[PDB]
């Protein structure tokens, strides 16, 4: 750890080991025809992107790192924070079934084998996986990490920075180029965090309908119940935060982590891992590993739950600050849904929206109105039209459900995933059945008319069910 200075506003701690940022996309066009105006396309691919002449990917990454050197917003008032945290912990103790510890074997099995091991080998995890265990280098890395876990010994996570290959609005390619920062965790940290927090994460997933952290929900199976519950409350809103992860305070995440640790079956071992996760983070940006003291270190498996929990603490602190009602009463009078930064907030309380917005902003968060104008967040008295997990919530005669917007459905027709390549507009030879049947489902939820337009598009080239049938399957079966 010898070099020094400042990289993208953040301290340099060492030289970096990360491989080069990706110059390819997994998205291919489904026909050679020209795309409509305003059509979304895969994010910028760097100096070799034929579509535009933009900055280096490393510069694009430096842009994403800016928010992490911004100053934090403020802690909620301490007396409110303490009471909110207690009420959250208490609700979780009243609902979660105690779990057994996770074994090394279980931890290994849980890892997604089709992503990278991160530092130091940067290889797809499948490559040292036998079907039942890690061998070779990953085996060594995993076993060592597991030993350290069992001994309650600290290890420093090393995260690897990347940029997300996804379809984006054209202006993010042909205007001011943007591309989203991803933190990839090192396999050692994944093994330790899996063993320590997999149990809590499982317990919490079993309650995803009765508790606000919805991670693990099935939209088609649980959405109807989840949204029917929200609708029992009068006022509905969604703060639609900007840059949620980069604006988090580690002090808040430490509060969320404390709760996770105390509700874990190996709390002394889990405490060591959570402290490592929340200590100033080492992020490999290629040239340098830099130190990031603030924001969400979003590599590991449990981080969505941790982030969700931090979301819960802040939303509730803001509501208590403004309404001056006790946390437990706010919770009696509300239904929340959280998935990382994504929220739905339903309440019977008459919130002073201007005062609510100001408190969120005082905490360093960046809530945004639907019109992106300045001023206070808005609320409505129907759940319908609020979104969660990229679906509009819709109510009808049969009940509530989540519907994918037409535009997202169109997009999945224009593009298909396949191996990585350099030119997005290239069509993939050689035809995705189950994915077609799913698309018909979503199309169906928009009526027979739109369903039929999508149904023709699907027939090419390529068992096309009737609207009424498929609707019934997706809504009820
Ligand atoms: C965030 C997100 C973004 C894109 C997709 C998604 O469906 N992507 C795609 C999958 C498969 C294909 S395929 O090539 O035809 O097989 C896609 C093809 C084109 C475009 C997409 S995409 O929507 O633009 O990514 C595809 C899914 C998600 N994930 C969710 O909607 C999601 C996340 C967590 C939980 C739930 N959920 O419980 O409903 C749903
Ligand atoms: Mg939302």
Residue numbers in the entry: 3 to 433, 436 to 466, 474 to 488
Copy the relevant paper text:
Norovirus (formerly Norwalk-like virus, NV) is a genus of the Caliciviridae family that is a major causative agent of non-bacterial acute gastroenteritis in humans. Among these, nonstructural protein 7 [RNA-dependent RNA polymerase (RdRp) domain] plays a key role in genome replication, as well as in the synthesis and amplification of additional subgenomic RNA. Notably, since RdRp is not present in mammalian cells, it appears as a suitable target for inhibition in the context of antiviral prophylaxis. Inspection of the crystal structures showed that 6 binds to a site located in the polymerase thumb domain, more specifically in a cleft along the exit path for the newly synthesized RNA.
6 diffraction data were collected at 100 K at the ESRF beam line ID29 (Grenoble, France); the crystal structure was solved by MR (2.3 Å resolution) and refined to final crystallographic R-factor/R-free values of 18.5/24.8%. Six mNV-RdRp molecules are hosted in the crystal asymmetric unit. Inspection of the refined model shows that the naphthalene disulphonate head of the inhibitor binds to the same RdRp location identified for hNV-RdRp. In the murine protein compound 6 could be fully modeled in all the subunits of the crystal asymmetric unit. The observed roto-translation of the ligand is related to the loss of the interaction with Gln439 and with His433, both pointing toward the solvent in mNV RdRp. Such shift of the ligand molecule promotes the stacking interaction of the toluene group of 6 with Arg392 guanidine moiety (H-bonded to 6 carbonyl, and in electrostatic interaction with 2 sulphonates), which allows the stabilization of the entire inhibitor. On the contrary in the mNV-RdRp/6 structure, the inhibitor could be completely modeled thanks to the different disposition of the naphthalene head due to the loss of the interaction with His433. On the contrary, the higher inhibitory potency of 6 against mNV-RdRp correlates with a fully defined binding mode and interactions of the inhibitor to the RdRp active site.
